[PDB]
Write an enzyme that holds these catalytic residues in place. Structure first.
Site, short mmCIF file in Angstrom:
data_model
loop_
_atom_site.label_atom_id
_atom_site.label_comp_id
_atom_site.label_asym_id
_atom_site.label_seq_id
_atom_site.Cartn_x
_atom_site.Cartn_y
_atom_site.Cartn_z
CE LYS A 1 -3.92 2.00 2.24
NZ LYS A 1 -5.23 2.15 3.00
CG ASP B 1 -6.86 4.35 11.40
OD1 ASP B 1 -6.50 4.12 11.52
OD2 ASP B 1 -8.37 4.58 10.12
#
Length: 554
Positions: free
Chosen positions: A71, A199
Site C-alpha cells: 500500500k 486512526d
C-alpha cells in the site's frame, strides 16, 4: 437478481478486512482460519504462493520473498523519495521497470517481478474468496476504501488491483469517511457537522477533519504519521526487557533472533492485556541461555515507556485542527479507528484534549472502516435509506455562492451548507482609478478561481462617480428565499443607485453526484488553491471585465 450482494473492503497496510451488509446488519467475514482481519502479506516459495495468515507466519524463514506494505507503493513512481526512503526498510527487492516500482522475488525457483497493484490484487483475491466462502455465491461488486490523502494516481491503482482480481469497484471512498458512515454520522443530517477521525493502526497514523452536511462529505484537513503505530509501542516494551535481562543476568539476548522473536510476541500479548488490566505477566521458558524469564509490566510503565510516542499523537491533531481552520470546540464528533486506539492512555489524552467530550468507539476499531465500506456498498445496490420522507429536513446551500473580485478570484458570499432563507451582504470597491463601474458576476462552486467554478449570471453597475481607486463603496447582497430563488443586487453606497438580477436556482440541476464530484475536486486542489489564496488582496471589483480577457504564459 439475488446472485451476489455488495462487499465492503478495507485494504489496509498491514491487515485487510472485508464485511457485508446482509439482513439489515453489517457482518465482518472471518477467514478460513477463523480471523476477522487478514494480514496483507504475499509470500513466494519454491512450491506455492501464500496470502494472509499463512504468508506472514513463515516470514521469518522466507524474508526476501515475503512481501508487505504494498500500500506504500501503490500509484507511486519508483523515484518518489517516499519510495526511496521506504525501500531501505524492506527485506524484499524493489526494482524500477520503466518508471514504476516492481517487487522482485524468487517464486518456484524463478525470478519474478510484480507491480504493486498486482500484489494488492492478490490480497483482494484472498479477501474475495473469504467472502465467497461465507456467502456461498460469487462475489463481484465491492467498495474499496483508501486513505484521504491518496491522489488520483493512487486511487486508480487501488482500483486496478480490484479489477485484476475480477472485482467491479463501485466506488473508492476515503477511510475517514467510511468510518463516519459506519457510525451513521452522515444520516444525522441537520446542522453542519465537523468530524475528527483519529486512526491509529499497526504502523500508520492518520488524522482527518471531515465536515458533513446534507449527506455530503468534505475533507477539510489531513495529517498524521506514516511510520508510527502499534508495532512501535511493542518495540518500546521489547527493548525495555532486553535491557532488564542484560541487567539481571548480564546477558544480551540480541545475538539470538528467535529469542527476540519470542520476546516481541510476549510483549504484543501483554500490550493487549494492558488495554484492559493494570498489569501484564511475562513468562518465557528458557528465553536465552537456558534462563527462564518471569516478570510483569504495569500499564504505568508501559505508558511511561511510550510517553513521548503517546503525547506526540496530539501534534497531528493540532496541525489538522489548524489546517482545517477551526477550534477544538468546533468538533461535533470524534471517531476512534485502528487497533492502537484501545490503549487507555491514548484515549485519555484524546479526551482530555477535548475537555472530556465523549468518544465514538463502540464499533471494533479494526473493523470500523471495513464496516462502513460495507454499509456504503449496500446503498449502491439496494438498501432502505430514504430519510427524506418523515417530514421536512433542513434545506441548505448545495454549493458555495459568490462573486469574482480582481484577478479572477472567487470571494464567497454564502458558503455551502448555510441554512436556507438567509441574506448575506459584503462591501467592495473599484480596482483602478476613476472606474466607470463594476461588473457583478455570480459564481457557484468550491474552487478558488472563478475559472474553476460555474457562472450563474452577471449584471453591471455603471455610473460610479470618478474616485481614487478604493473609494467607491458597493454593497453586494445575496438573498435566498424559502423556495430557493437567489437575488443578487448591488448598491453604490454614495448615491443609492442599484441593479439586480434574479437567478433561477430551481430544478434538480445538481444531483448528489455533481456536488460530491465538485467537493472532491476542491480538496484535490487544496494547495494550488490555499496558495492561490494569496495572489491578490482585498475585495475589489474588476474594471467591468470578466477574467475572460487574454490569457498569458505559464
Amino acid at each position: 437478481m439475488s446472485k451476489g450482494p455488495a462487499v465492503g473492503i478495507d485494504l489496509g497496510t498491514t491487515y485487510s478486512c472485508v464485511g457485508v451488509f446482509q439482513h439489515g446488519k453489517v457482518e465482518i467475514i472471518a477467514n478460513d482460519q477463523g480471523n476477522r482481519t487478514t494480514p496483507s502479506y504475499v509470500a513466494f516459495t519454491d512450491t506455492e504462493r501464500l496470502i494472509g495468515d499463512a504468508a506472514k507466519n513463515q516470514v521469518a524463514m522466507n524474508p526476501t520473498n515475503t512481501v508487505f506494505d504494498a500500500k506504500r507503493l501503490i500509484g507511486r513512481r519508483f523515484d518518489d523519495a517516499v519510495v526511496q526512503s521506504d525501500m531501505k526498510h524492506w527485506p524484499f527487492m524493489v526494482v524500477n521497470d520503466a518508471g514504476r516500482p516492481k517487487v522482485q522475488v524468487e517464486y518456484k525457483g524463478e525470478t519474478k517481478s510484480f507491480y504493486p497493484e498486482e500484489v494488492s490484487s492478490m490480497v483482494l483475491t484472498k479477501m474475495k474468496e473469504i467472502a465467497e466462502a461465507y456467502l456461498g455465491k460469487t462475489v463481484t461488486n465491492a467498495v474499496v476504501t483508501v486513505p484521504a490523502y491518496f491522489n488520483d494516481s493512487q486511487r486508480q491503482a487501488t482500483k486496478d488491483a480490484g479489477t485484476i482480481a475480477g472485482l467491479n469497484v463501485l466506488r473508492i471512498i476515503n477511510e475517514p469517511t467510511a468510518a463516519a458512515i459506519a457510525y451513521g454520522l452522515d444520516k444525522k443530517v441537520g446542522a453542519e457537522r465537523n468530524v475528527l477521525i483519529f486512526d491509529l493502526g499497526g504502523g500508520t497514523f492518520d488524522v482527518s477533519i471531515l465536515t458533513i452536511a446534507a449527506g455530503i462529505f468534505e475533507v477539510k484537513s489531513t495529517a498524521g504519521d506514516t511510520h508510527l503505530g502499534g508495532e512501535d509501542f511493542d518495540n518500546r516494551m521489547v527493548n525495555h526487557f532486553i535491557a532488564e535481562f542484560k541487567r539481571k543476568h548480564k546477558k544480551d539476548i540480541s545475538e539470538n533472533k528467535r529469542a527476540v522473536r519470542r520476546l516481541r510476541t510476549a510483549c504484543e500479548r501483554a500490550k493487549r492485556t494492558l488495554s484492559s488490566s493494570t498489569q501484564a505477566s511475562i513468562e518465557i521458558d528458557s528465553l536465552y541461555e537456558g534462563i527462564d524469564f518471569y516478570t510483569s509490566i504495569t500499564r504505568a510503565r508501559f505508558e511511561e515507556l511510550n510517553a513521548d510516542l503517546f503525547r506526540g499523537t496530539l501534534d497531528p491533531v493540532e496541525k489538522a485542527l489548524r489546517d482545517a481552520k477551526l477550534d477544538k470546540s468546533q468538533i461535533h464528533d470524534i471517531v476512534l479507528v485502528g487497533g492502537s486506539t484501545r490503549i487507555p492512555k491514548i484515549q485519555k489524552l484524546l479526551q482530555d484534549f477535548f475537555n472530556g467530550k465523549e468518544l465514538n468507539k463502540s464499533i471494533n476499531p479494526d473493523e470500523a472502516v471495513a464496516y462502513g465500506a460495507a454499509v456504503q456498498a449496500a446503498i449502491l445496490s439496494g438498501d432502505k435509506s430514504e430519510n427524506v420522507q418523515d417530514l421536512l429536513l433542513l434545506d441548505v446551500t448545495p454549493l458555495s455562492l459568490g462573486i469574482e473580485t480582481a484577478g479572477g478570484v472567487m470571494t464567497v458570499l454564502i458558503k455551502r451548507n448555510t441554512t436556507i432563507p438567509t441574506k448575506q451582504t459584503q462591501t467592495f470597491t473599484t480596482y483602478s482609478d476613476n472606474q466607470p463601474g463594476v461588473l457583478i458576476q455570480v459564481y457557484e462552486g468550491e474552487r478558488a478561481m472563478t475559472k474553476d467554478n460555474n457562472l450563474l449570471g452577471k449584471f453591471e453597475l455603471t455610473g460610479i462617480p470618478p474616485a481614487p481607486r478604493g473609494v467607491p463603496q458597493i454593497e453586494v447582497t445575496f438573498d435566498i428565499d424559502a423556495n430557493g430563488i437567489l437575488n443578487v443586487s448591488a448598491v453604490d453606497k454614495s448615491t443609492g443607485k442599484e441593479n439586480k438580477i434574479t437567478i433561477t436556482n430551481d430544478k434538480g440541476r445538481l444531483s448528489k453526484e455533481d456536488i460530491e464530484r465538485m467537493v472532491q475536486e476542491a480538496e484535490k486542489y487544496k494547495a494550488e488553491d490555499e496558495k492561490q489564496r494569496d495572489k491578490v488582496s482585498s475585495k475589489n471589483s474588476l474594471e467591468s471585465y470578466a477574467f475572460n480577457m487574454k490569457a498569458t504564459v505559464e
